Design a protein around this ligand. Structure first.
Ligand SMILES: *[C@@H]1O[C@H](CO)[C@@H](O[C@@H]2O[C@H](CO)[C@@H](O[C@@H]3O[C@H](CO[C@H]4O[C@H](CO)[C@@H](O)[C@H](O[C@H]5O[C@H](CO)[C@@H](O)[C@H](O)[C@@H]5O[C@H]5O[C@H](CO)[C@@H](O)[C@H](O)[C@@H]5O)[C@@H]4O)[C@@H](O)[C@H](O)[C@@H]3O)[C@H](O)[C@H]2NC(C)=O)[C@H](O)[C@H]1NC(C)=O
Ligand SMILES: CC/C=C\C/C=C\C/C=C/CCCCCCCC(=O)OC[C@@H](O)COP(=O)(O)O
Ligand SMILES: *[C@@H]1O[C@H](CO)[C@@H](O[C@@H]2O[C@H](CO)[C@@H](O)[C@H](O)[C@H]2NC(C)=O)[C@H](O)[C@H]1NC(C)=O
Ligand SMILES: *[C@@H]1O[C@H](CO)[C@@H](O[C@@H]2O[C@H](CO)[C@@H](O)[C@H](O)[C@H]2NC(C)=O)[C@H](O)[C@H]1NC(C)=O
Ligand SMILES: [Ca+2]
Ligand SMILES: [K+]
Ligand code: NA
Ligand SMILES: [Zn+2]
Ligand SMILES: [Zn+2]
Length: 782
């Protein structure tokens, strides 16, 4: 019980936490039914609006006014933000020339630059192109500070998952807010945007920035604002807190605006109607910046202007209905819209038939505007599977479309789609002493920001999914010095030890300076305890695992001019024992011969051997990996057509390929116990995915093998599946569908590192920070 009888006299938006029985005067109160009886009256004044007019200057203070223009307002910290411009002849901040801020210029008593996070909902990256004509304050922040052309949100590209990702540095599958709506089968409870259940702390994982700050003795303003509190009041409140005594004043602040999202939904992202809400947000940024200038803080504070996701054109007319595919949709619950998650309407309903459902949803219309996935099959770059609140059955929906359960307008915009979709990209600008001046940075992912916000506040981040140091290039100071992970397992370098006669595998073949040409960036370090051998070859090098019986990685270089050659018919089924590696640590062809479903492929492609002699090396048993015929369609096209195409296009490429095991879909390297499938009758483990990392010189005029400067990388994590049901056009020639599949499964090098326990690019001429940026890069193909 809370005693509402008390008063918010001299308590408005107090920062001190107040529990029952006493009543509150903070943001969470209206929201919690714990406000004092005079909260609305004392704390939410509106009288006379938000701006000083000439006729108010010098006024005697009336405590009923929303803000003040009286002579004492400044030391009281409650002037309207435009007070000085109107009453003291000062200029608006936006009208002042841009000037580099080389060090914080802070008033007496400020020990470090405060951080203000100004978050905007549904701010599409491309809105920035409207420029100073529509958004002059934001344009000044953008042009004079540090900006990315866009920032990538997490999937699903909706508000709750993204704002909490900004706050924690975690993927939704790890922080737990996997949607705006979710069902937790263990709680047997439902979380909704609307309603009180979301207030229960059990839903919220990881450690958000405000808790991290507080635990390290750094004070935070509110990161929650009640919907009933107008934006102008939010800004005045922040400015009031910044005027507090040294021993009360917070170091970190957040502002949130539900615009331009609301208007985007109503009018669509390209509507002329979007101009007004954008002007309104800019006006709010102006109030903040004018207010800061009034406090002599405009060259002291670091300001982050950041969005949660973008906005796409989505209308009533573009809705797929599940009732068109399934006979009884009244028996399922669908989280609908720009994504789909399906579960039985009755929890744990035994008649739920997910295999039959997926079958009826797979490639059933030519123009089908979604694709069903079991969550383990979703592209790994989405990191969207390892949480009990994520339904097994997912629908990835095509941009511009909705999926709904059945047919049983007022919106023209929506978002939630695959986070590499252009329309979903959002904004990032950093301005202040700690950010660089007039600097553009490449796009980056929102998971990276928590680390940077900790850097800006002198905090040590809780464990998270950012790669700390990968954004050092945004900062003038406060950068994080990363340290190389130490290698855990040193390799063996086995020389010859066996004779062909020593081998009984069922295999038949009916007929320096390797490290220099083929390992351009050093050997990958193995960051777990295991046993493996380096193997050298004219055309390739590998780290062969004696445990998993195949390479952990195979590395090779292909020159721009490289020749593509066939596999001679007499070598079609050629597999050769490797006299460097014991028969007991080798695969055997017998298992393949006997397994009616599983075939094999090679990591280094015989198609790219330098000579007919060299080709024989590609047929070694130590280059062989288990591949379903379905996967082989993809892999052969990749080995035979695409790698060469890349070399020709990029002036040579260096390729590192290998297996990934992630049977429990947690995005991390499986241990032996977690592997669940082997080649028939054998102990040869079956990868869930195969990766390839393709590196070249960013300066394409230089060959990959003689690159003096920054690198260019594209990588993939291809799902190893027994069919190509994912690819609706796979009945056609590989040239009509394989690249499309690969693009969907693009990946960061960092993603591969998590999944493999390997550490790449340890011997380069670049800084460690640059390499970390490279490893976080995602080639999106948009
Ligand atoms: C992205 O970055 C994160 C953070 O580093 C990595 O996630 C971590 O993975 C490790 C290794 O697998 C896990 O270690 C295990 O820890 C558990 C005990 O964990 C409990 O206590 C910790 C510390 O207080 C807490 O963070 C954990 O929180 C999980 O569980 C909460 C309660 O149910 C839940 O509210 C929260 O959202 C989180 O759930 C997520 O993780 C669990 C696995 O723990 C998973 O089942 C769930 O679906 C969510 O994904 C928890 O209370 C020990 O018993 C083990 O021995 C082991 O040491 C970390 O717990 C885990 N941390 C978090 C916060 O998720 C990701 O691997 C990384 N991803 C990638 C791809 O790199
Ligand atoms: C570093 C932190 C980044 C920003 C600070 C702001 C919040 C940090 C908070 C994380 C928890 C946030 C919980 C949500 C508060 C806003 C709820 C909201 O107002 O939803 C608006 C609604 O349109 C979203 O629906 P939609 O995704 O647009 O379909
Ligand atoms: C709820 O709050 C009201 C207001 O503070 C409390 O009223 C006071 O109670 C004390 C204790 O007997 C009296 O001495 C005061 O005269 C009251 N003050 C006013 C201004 O009303 C009330 O006691 C609270 N209810 C509780 C404590 O259960
Ligand atoms: C999958 O789709 C088929 C139709 O293509 C559904 O089968 C129909 O539904 C009922 C019950 O099975 C039959 O009486 C109809 O004759 C079938 N229609 C056709 C056109 O053959 C099947 O029910 C669907 N499965 C699911 C799980 O929804
Ligand atoms: Ca795993
Ligand atoms: K076979
Ligand atoms: Na198919
Ligand atoms: Zn949003
Ligand atoms: Zn929205």
């Amino acid at each position: 019980w809370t005693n509402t009888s008390g008063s918010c006299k001299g308590r408005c938006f107090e920062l001190q936490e107040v529990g029952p029985p006493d009543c509150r005067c903070d943001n969470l109160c209206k929201s919690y039914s714990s406000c004092c009886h005079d909260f609305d009256e004392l704390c939410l004044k509106t009288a006379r609006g938000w701006e000083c007019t000439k006729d108010r200057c010098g006024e005697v203070r009336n405590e009923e006014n929303a803000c003040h223009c009286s002579e004492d307002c400044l030391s009281r910290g409650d002037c309207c933000t435009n007070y000085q411009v109107v009453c003291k002849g000062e200029s608006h901040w936006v009208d002042d020339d841009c000037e580099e801020i080389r060090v914080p210029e802070c008033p007496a008593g400020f020990v470090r630059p405060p951080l203000i996070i100004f978050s905007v909902d549904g701010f599409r990256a491309s809105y920035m192109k409207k420029g100073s004509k529509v958004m002059p304050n934001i344009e000044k922040l953008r042009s004079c500070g540090t900006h990315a052309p866009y920032m990538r949100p997490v999937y699903p590209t909706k508000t709750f998952p993204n704002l909490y990702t900004l706050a924690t540095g975690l993927y939704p599958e790890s922080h737990g807010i996997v949607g705006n709506s979710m069902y937790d089968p263990v709680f047997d409870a439902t979380f909704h945007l609307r309603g009180r259940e979301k207030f229960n702390h059990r839903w919220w994982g990881g450690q958000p920035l405000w808790i991290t700050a507080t635990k390290q003795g750094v004070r935070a303003g509110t990161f929650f604002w009640s919907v009933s509190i107008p934006h102008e009041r939010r800004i005045l409140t922040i400015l009031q807190w910044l005027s507090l005594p040294d021993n009360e004043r917070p170091s970190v602040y957040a502002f949130y605006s539900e615009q331009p999202d609301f208007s985007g939904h109503k009018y669509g992202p390209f509507g002329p109607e979007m101009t007004n809400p954008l002007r309104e947000i800019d006006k709010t940024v102006g109030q903040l910046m004018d207010g800061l200038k009034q406090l002599k803080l405009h060259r002291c504070v670091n300001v982050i202007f950041v969005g949660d996701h973008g906005m796409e054109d989505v209308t009533c007319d573009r809705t797929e209905f599940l009732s068109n595919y399934l006979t009884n949709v009244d028996d399922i619950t669908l989280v609908p819209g720009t994504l789909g998650r399906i579960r039985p309407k009755i929890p744990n309903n035994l008649k739920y038939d997910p295999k039959a459902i997926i079958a009826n949803l797979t490639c059933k219309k030519p123009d089908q505007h979604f694709k069903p996935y079991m969550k383990q099959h979703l592209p790994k770059r989405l990191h969207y599977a390892n949480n009990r609140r994520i339904e097994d059955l997912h629908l990835l929906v095509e941009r511009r479309w909705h999926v709904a359960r059945k047919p049983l307008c007022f919106f023209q915009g929506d978002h939630g789609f695959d986070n590499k979709v252009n329309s979903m990209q959002t904004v990032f600008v950093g301005y202040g002493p700690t950010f660089k001046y007039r600097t553009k940075v490449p796009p980056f992912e929102n998971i990276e920001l928590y680390n940077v916000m900790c850097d800006l506040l002198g905090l040590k981040p809780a464990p998270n999914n950012g790669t700390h140091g990968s954004l050092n290039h945004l900062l003038r100071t406060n950068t994080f010095r990363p340290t190389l992970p130490e290698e855990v397992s040193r390799p063996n370098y086995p020389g010859i030890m066996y004779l062909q006669s020593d081998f009984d595998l069922g295999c038949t073949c009916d007929d320096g300076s390797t490290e220099e040409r083929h390992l351009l960036y050093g050997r990958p370090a193995v960051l777990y305890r295991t046993s493996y051998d380096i193997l050298y070859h004219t055309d390739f090098e590998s780290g062969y695992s004696e445990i998993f019986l195949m390479p952990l990685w195979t590395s090779y270089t292909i020159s721009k001019q490289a020749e593509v050659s066939s596999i001679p018919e007499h070598l079609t089924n050629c597999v050769r024992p490797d006299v460097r590696v014991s028969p007991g640590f080798s695969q055997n062809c017998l298992a393949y011969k006997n397994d009616k479903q599983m075939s094999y492929g090679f990591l280094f492609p015989p198609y790219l051997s330098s000579s007919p002699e060299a080709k024989y090396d590609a047929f070694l048993v130590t280059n062989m990996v288990p591949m379903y015929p379905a996967f082989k369609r993809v892999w052969t096209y990749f080995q035979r057509v695409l790698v060469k195409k890349y070399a020709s296009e990029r002036n040579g490429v260096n390729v590192i390929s290998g297996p990934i095991f992630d049977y429990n879909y947690n995005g991390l390297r499986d241990i032996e116990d977690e592997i669940k499938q082997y080649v028939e009758g054998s102990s040869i483990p079956v990868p869930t995915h195969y990766y390839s990392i393709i590196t070249s010189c960013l300066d394409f005029t230089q060959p990959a093998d003689k690159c003096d400067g920054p690198l260019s990388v594209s990588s993939f994590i291809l799902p190893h599946r027994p069919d190509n049901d994912e690819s609706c056009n796979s009945s056609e020639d590989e040239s009509k569908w394989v690249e499309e599949l690969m693009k969907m499964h693009t990946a960061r090098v960092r993603d591969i590192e998590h999944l493999t326990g390997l550490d790449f690019y340890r011997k380069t001429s670049r800084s460690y920070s640059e390499i970390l940026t490279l490893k976080t890069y995602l080639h999106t193909y948009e």
